[PDB]
């Protein structure tokens, strides 16, 4: 039609902010791409680096951006992971050619994307936004810091935070944590099993993240301990290929002398309490005058988890959502969000955004859902990309894609040892393949 170019901000260049800044150029937009770190892929990139803090508790800490462990594996195979127009299959040569890869071919994957779609040449690198603020008129302003101590700013007319959601931890309330004697960190420090050798280590956390790190620790760990508060029934239970791991289902009380009780009844001395408990949402750059908050991690108000109704759509989030499959999820908000800052296409009016979003909260609260699960979508999420596409006019997620997300949900539950190397959907991925062809 007669569309409309904007100039707009991104702040971040992980898998968001990247494909977002691509979407962004497709619809005609120009694009300032604001990146903290030295190089793209935000928490793909892994470091040895852990803050200072083992529990990064400390407002003062220098910040680690990756929580990636040494070892970590991708949680779903590459099929389903890859953005709607760019297959994450194998190299020609070389590479981890696994279903389910280590984060080294995630951060080529997205380092080739960013190659691939002139993203990355763009990237402003080593420029923190410390400042986002609305100008009278509409306008965006965003402060940035440089490597040197120095910086700057620049005006725009639409903002999209790219920052995400996997850096500022969040903790799990341990009774009588205050006398306990040994060592505490948040998982988000976690990196690799050797200095674990012989320690009883207890976990925390009901995801299987949690176990991955477990089954990682019992490596060299003479114990670990899962406290799985989802667990209910038979424990304590052996995890099954492992001698040396148990799964709880809550801490019951830790003690001065070091020990730490179980529901179960299961009482054992622990070196190491470790918190896989995840994280918070965190924008201090963020100068909305109140507009938007993040309270229990709910993020808004955000119409459709994106875009803050009284700032829409100058003012937009990619990739809040969790329990998600991130990257075709980021890439449909971010073509959304480009066909609404081109006009293409249209938003609804402040008020109608806005009792949208009341409309959610009274479901949830009709459903006994809490709070910190509002941006949860994990039972939906190919549903709610559907209505992304529908309102961009793009295709529907494939079936071999919902079918495959099913599948590898499943074995992960059932066989979170064995799910990456054994698996029996061959015919979903040979579909999977069929659509890749025309890329
Ligand atoms: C342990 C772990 C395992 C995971 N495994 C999988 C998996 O197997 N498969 C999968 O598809 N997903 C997985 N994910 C999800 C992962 O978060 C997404 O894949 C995706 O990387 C989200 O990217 P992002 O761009 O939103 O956030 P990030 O990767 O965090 O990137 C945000 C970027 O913004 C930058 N930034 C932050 N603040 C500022 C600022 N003030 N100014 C300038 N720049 C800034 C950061 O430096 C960073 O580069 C995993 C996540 C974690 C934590």
Same mark, same amino acid.
């Given at each position: 039609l007669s569309l409309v170019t904007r100039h707009v901000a991104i702040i971040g260049a992980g898998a968001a902010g990247l494909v977002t800044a691509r979407e962004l150029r497709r619809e005609g937009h120009?694009?300032? !791409?604001?990146?903290?770190? &030295? &190089? !793209?892929?935000?928490?793909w !990139?892994? =470091?040895? +680096?852990?803050?200072?803090?083992?529990?990064?508790?400390?407002?003062?800490?220098?910040?680690? #951006?990756?929580?990636?462990?040494? *070892? /970590?594996?991708?949680? /779903?195979?590459?099929?389903?992971?890859?953005? /709607? +127009?760019?297959?994450?299959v194998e190299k020609?040569?070389?590479?981890?050619?696994r279903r389910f890869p280590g984060h080294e071919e995630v951060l080529d994957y997205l380092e080739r994307f960013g190659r691939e779609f002139g993203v990355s040449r763009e990237v402003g690198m080593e420029?923190? %936004? %410390?400042?986002?603020?609305?100008?009278?008129?509409?306008?965006? =302003?965003?402060?940035? $810091?440089? $490597? +040197?101590?120095?910086?700057?700013?620049?005006?725009?007319?639409?903002?999209?935070?790219?920052?995400? #959601?996997?850096?500022?931890?969040?903790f799990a309330e341990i009774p009588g944590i205050d006398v306990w004697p040994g060592k505490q960190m948040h998982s #988000?420090?976690?990196?690799?099993?050797?200095?674990? #050798?012989?320690?009883? %280590?207890? !976990?925390?956390? *009901? &995801?299987?993240?949690? %176990?991955?790190? &477990?089954?990682?620790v019992a490596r060299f760990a003479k114990e670990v301990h899962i406290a799985n508060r989802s667990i209910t029934e038979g424990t304590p239970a052996k995890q099954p290929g492992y001698d040396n791991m148990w799964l709880h289902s809550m801490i019951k009380i830790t003690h001065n002398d070091g020990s730490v009780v179980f529901h179960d009844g299961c009482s054992v001395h622990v070196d190491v309490i470790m918190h896989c408990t995840g994280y918070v949402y965190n924008f201090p750059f963020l100068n909305t005058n109140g507009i938007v908050t993040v309270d229990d991690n709910r993020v808004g108000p955000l119409y459709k988890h994106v875009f803050p109704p009284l700032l829409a759509p100058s003012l937009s989030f990619v990739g809040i959502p969790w329990k998600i499959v991130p990257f075709p999820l980021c890439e449909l908000q971010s073509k959304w969000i480009a066909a609404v800052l081109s006009g293409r296409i249209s938003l609804p009016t402040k008020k109608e955004m806005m009792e949208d979003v009341e409309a959610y909260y009274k479901q949830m609260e009709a459903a006994g859902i809490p709070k910190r699960y509002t941006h949860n979508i994990g039972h939906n999420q190919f549903d709610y990309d559907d209505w992304l596409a529908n309102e961009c006019g793009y295709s529907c997620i494939e079936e071999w894609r919902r079918l495959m997300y099913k599948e590898v949900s499943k074995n992960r539950k059932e066989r979170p040892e064995s799910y990456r190397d054994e698996w029996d959907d061959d015919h979903l991925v040979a579909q999977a393949r069929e659509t890749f062809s025309k890329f």
């Amino acid at each position: 039609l007669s569309l409309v170019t904007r100039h707009v901000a991104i702040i971040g260049a992980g898998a968001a902010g990247l494909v977002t800044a691509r979407e962004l150029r497709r619809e005609g937009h120009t694009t300032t !791409i604001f990146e903290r770190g &030295s &190089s !793209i892929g935000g928490t793909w !990139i892994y =470091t040895p +680096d852990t803050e200072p803090d083992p529990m990064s508790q400390d407002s003062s800490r220098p910040i680690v #951006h990756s929580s990636l462990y040494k *070892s /970590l594996r991708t949680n /779903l195979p590459r099929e389903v992971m890859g953005f /709607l +127009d760019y297959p994450f299959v194998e190299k020609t040569n070389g590479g981890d050619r696994r279903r389910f890869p280590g984060h080294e071919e995630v951060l080529d994957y997205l380092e080739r994307f960013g190659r691939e779609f002139g993203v990355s040449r763009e990237v402003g690198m080593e420029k923190e %936004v %410390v400042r986002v603020d609305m100008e009278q008129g509409g306008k965006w =302003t965003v402060k940035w $810091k440089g $490597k +040197d101590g120095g910086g700057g700013e620049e005006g725009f007319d639409a903002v999209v935070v790219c920052n995400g #959601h996997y850096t500022e931890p969040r903790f799990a309330e341990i009774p009588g944590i205050d006398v306990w004697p040994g060592k505490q960190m948040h998982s #988000h420090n976690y990196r690799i099993p050797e200095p674990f #050798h012989d320690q009883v %280590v207890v !976990i925390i956390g *009901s &995801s299987a993240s949690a %176990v991955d790190i &477990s089954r990682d620790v019992a490596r060299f760990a003479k114990e670990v301990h899962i406290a799985n508060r989802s667990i209910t029934e038979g424990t304590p239970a052996k995890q099954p290929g492992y001698d040396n791991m148990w799964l709880h289902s809550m801490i019951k009380i830790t003690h001065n002398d070091g020990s730490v009780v179980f529901h179960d009844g299961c009482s054992v001395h622990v070196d190491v309490i470790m918190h896989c408990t995840g994280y918070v949402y965190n924008f201090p750059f963020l100068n909305t005058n109140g507009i938007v908050t993040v309270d229990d991690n709910r993020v808004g108000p955000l119409y459709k988890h994106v875009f803050p109704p009284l700032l829409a759509p100058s003012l937009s989030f990619v990739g809040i959502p969790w329990k998600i499959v991130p990257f075709p999820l980021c890439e449909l908000q971010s073509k959304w969000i480009a066909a609404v800052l081109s006009g293409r296409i249209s938003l609804p009016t402040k008020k109608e955004m806005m009792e949208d979003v009341e409309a959610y909260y009274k479901q949830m609260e009709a459903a006994g859902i809490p709070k910190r699960y509002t941006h949860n979508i994990g039972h939906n999420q190919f549903d709610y990309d559907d209505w992304l596409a529908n309102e961009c006019g793009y295709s529907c997620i494939e079936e071999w894609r919902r079918l495959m997300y099913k599948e590898v949900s499943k074995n992960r539950k059932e066989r979170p040892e064995s799910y990456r190397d054994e698996w029996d959907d061959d015919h979903l991925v040979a579909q999977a393949r069929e659509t890749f062809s025309k890329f």
